[PDB]
Structure formats: structure tokens, C-alpha cells
Amino acid sequence: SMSYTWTGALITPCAAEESKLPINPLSNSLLRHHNMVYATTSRSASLRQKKVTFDRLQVLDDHYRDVLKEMKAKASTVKAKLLSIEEACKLTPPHSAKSKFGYGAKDVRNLSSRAVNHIRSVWEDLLEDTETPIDTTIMAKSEVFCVQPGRKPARLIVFPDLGVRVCEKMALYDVVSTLPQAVMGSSYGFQYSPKQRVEFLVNTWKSKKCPMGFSYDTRCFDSTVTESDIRVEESIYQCCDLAPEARQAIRSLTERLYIGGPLTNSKGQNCGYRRCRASGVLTTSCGNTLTCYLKATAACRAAKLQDCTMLVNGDDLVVICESAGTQEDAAALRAFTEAMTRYSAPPGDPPQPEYDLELITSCSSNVSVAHDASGKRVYYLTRDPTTPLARAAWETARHTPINSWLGNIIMYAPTLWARMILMTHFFSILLAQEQLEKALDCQIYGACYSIEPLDLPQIIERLHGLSAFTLHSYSPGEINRVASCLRKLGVPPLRTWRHRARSVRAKLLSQGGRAATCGRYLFNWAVRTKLKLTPIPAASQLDLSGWFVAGYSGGDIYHS
């Protein structure tokens, strides 16, 4: 079975597509080498099409079946609730793609009679019709990158209509929110906040007598997912206590949408047929996580890797285990990869065994070390800041509906680059435009949030602890990665950012209130005469439930 078949009709944009970074004074302050920054477009879709289109081999074995049964056992503890129309409508982003049937996300959120009646009929049809493939739209996603010699083609997104998406939520939101944790336990990555996640990686690393770790990068994971994989995934969902209508909906969604179906371009033309994972449905993150974990757990047994602890976030996979020795780890890792390959998860790049935790990257991120005010070692997550910086420059120049810079500040708050560059650059702008109190959209684990920049200090304390405001003596390797990133992108040197932050810090303090709290906490790094930083009372009061429960990337999820 081919992941995809194509009619020859093009993947088309539904509007004009910017690919170049404008020459704008505000963005130019952040990043001068504007021609290094680009956004993907429709024009590179045929290149992507070529990469995601292949035959799949899958041979299942007893290790695979053993693990599956174990997961199902855990799954059968779960009792999933059916979401009400109102509840599902509330989870729809304000700017989610309109329906082809004469209503949009706004109508969904407002529970208008048109949207709601169409949603009911979609739901009833799921219950009645078990076979008819549901239509999907295929689009080229616009994402911003820095050039590296040369360019990434656009990713392809495949999604059903708004009415169907609201119905997936009713049938499956509780399931995709609750079940991965029940099944994978501590290995489910999306349950951790940043501090918890770092805690778990470090503890796991320090628990082994001789640790070895690796990341495993499946070549085009969504395309490696077979119809059997998606039906096995359904077999796990079906172990939950379900309302009968949910049980039918899942069955019908599986056969009509999840396993595959027709692809239609922005212009309504038949583009082809998908027989693999759609990027843009509710079950993608859950399904990818389960499938990845299943295959990897069985492949570990096949490779005889000892005392494995997995961390899985969709298609992202980290394994930490007990070293058997350099040669034998290399052999065992190769056997793991052949097992994965047989299970239809071949590697992009061969995995490499690693004996230093900081050398392992999970979801762009690695563990690094710094010291807090008292000189105590603190572990934190960081990443190469090249893409975050390129995207922030873009978002400075162009109004984008989702702000990666804001998500990056939240998730990488303790980092040198987030603190000195991103906070300084954006607080300066917001402060000059008097927009500090204006809420902005970002994402956390794929789900969309509306966040007030003035609540960043409380947010950051909750997610990272107070040490996020006091870190210093960063590793030489972190410092260099950052420093040399700034040279490449024509981002001013850190000393410039210190100078700018002092000025911003002062303006923030002068304003008093929540603004001044941002000044004390966010920019204490910038002054020699430091304020003593105590817990923020409002931090404990934040309702961050739902933040670090599950992954929702591609799932059309909005949280208020």
C-alpha cells in the first residue's frame, strides 16, 4: 500500500503567500540578515509530495503483539466521556478554517443555529454511515525557517471540514486527553511541564548505573503509519468505557477518516488518496504517540536493550537505557532500528548512541545546566535558537495569527536566548505600542492559548520555578551555540541586548503594577544590583489545568 496516490491536480494555495521577510525597522533591530529568513509556500509542495509518497512494509511479531495486549489492558481502565456540542464548540479556535457549508469558527463558538444543525447532521451521519470516506482538504503549510546550504519544502496538512472536527471532539477529546497517560504512564511526554520534564529526564538519566541514550527519527512518520496501525490504535480506544454513540462515531471515524480517504485541493479538485496518517485530525498526536511507543517498546525487546525508559511525544522518541559497552550498544541500536523498520518506522538518520544527556535532543530540545542565585546547579531545556529567532523576526514584521515567540518565551523561559533576546525585543515593542495588556495567541503542546504578556512572570514561575529569573553561568557550549547563531542571522550581540533590556526594565518599573513585576522578575538578569525575588502570589492562583495534559498538534484545540 502506498501512503499516497496522486491524480496530478496541484496542491493549491487559497490566497496569496508571502515567502520573504520584509525590510521593517522593528524586525531589522532583531535580525539584519533578512534574506536568510523565508517561509514555505505551495510552490514547494510537489517536492514534499515526493518525500511523503512511498510503499510501506510492515511485519508484525510476538513482541509487537505482547506490547499491544499490555497497552490494551491499561486502556481498559479508562472511562471516556462524550462531549456536549457546547463543550466541543468551545474548543474550536476563533480562526479555525470555516466550513464549506456556510458557517465558520465564530458561528461554532457562538452556537449559531446553522453551525449547530450542521454539526448534528454530521454526527447523525457518522452514526448511520460506517463506510463512506469523508472528504479532506490538503494544503501546503506556511512555516518560517533560516536557510542552510538549501530549503525545506512546505509540509502538507490534511484536514476534514469544520463540522467533522467538532464531531471528533465530542467522540474523542476526553479519550485523546486521558488515555495516553493511562497506557504509557511516565513515558507520555505531554503530561510534563518544562520543569517536570527536565526532572524526569535527569532522574531517568541518573537512575542508570551506566546510562546510554538516543533519539530515534522516523523518516516522515505520518506516512509510515499503515491502516493496520490506525486500526490497532482504534482497538486501544475501544477498550475504554464509551457511550454507544461515541463507540459508533469512533468506529465510523476510523474507517471513513483516520485510515485514509480522498484529498481535495483549495479549489475543490480531486488531488488523490491517502492511506496513512492525516496531520490535521484530533487523533494524530495521541495516535502517533501510541503507535510510536508500541513499535519502539517492541523494538527494544527485539534489540535486547536493557532497562529502557522511553519518552514519547507523537513521533518524537527518546530511549534511555543501561549501557552494555560501546560496541554492544552500537550493535543493539542497529537491531532496534531493523525492528522499527519491519514495523514500518524506518529511520531518517541512523540513531546514534549517546553517553551525555545534553547531547540528546527531544522535540528540538536538549538538557543543559546553569546556576541559580545561590550557585546551585539547575537543569533546564533549551534548543538551537535559529528557528525561534527567524520566526520572531517574521512575527515582528507581519501580523501572524499564532505567535511562536510567545510560546517560545513560555517554554524556554530559563534560556539565555529567550531571556536576553525574546523578552527584551517583545516587551520593548509592546511597551512602545502600549499593548502590554493585549492578549495574544500562542501554542503549548500544539494547543492554542490566549495569553496576556503581563502574566508571563507568574506563568514562568509555575512552569519553571523562580530559578528561571536568576540563572547564570550557562554552559560554554550553550553560550557558543547562541553567540554563533546571532552572527549567522545578523542578530545583535548579547551585550546589545543587555543594554536594551536595562532601558526596557526601567520603563516597566516606572509604570508600576503588573508591568513593574515584569521588570523585576523578567529582567533581573540585566542589572548588577539585583532585587531579591520571592514567589509571586498570583502564580499559585493561575488555573493551568489542561496545559500539560496531552498533545494536540494538528487537532484544532483552543483553550481559554
Ligand SMILES: Cc1cccc(C(=O)N2c3cccc(O)c3NC3=C([C@@H]2c2ccc(OCc4ccccc4)cc2F)S(=O)(=O)CC(C)(C)C3)n1
Ligand atoms: C506534530 C508537530 C509539529 C510541529 C510542532 C509540534 C508541537 O506541538 N511542538 C513541537 C514538537 C517538536 C519539535 C518542536 O520544535 C515543537 N515546537 C513547538 C511546540 C511543541 C513542543 C515543543 C517542545 C516539546 O518538548 C520539549 C520541551 C518541553 C517543555 C519545555 C521546553 C521544551 C514538545 C512539543 F510538543 S509548542 O509547545 O506547541 C510551541 C512552540 C513555540 C514551543 C513550538 N508538533
Ligand SMILES: [Cl-]
Ligand atoms: Cl519555533
Ligand SMILES: [Cl-]
Ligand atoms: Cl550593561
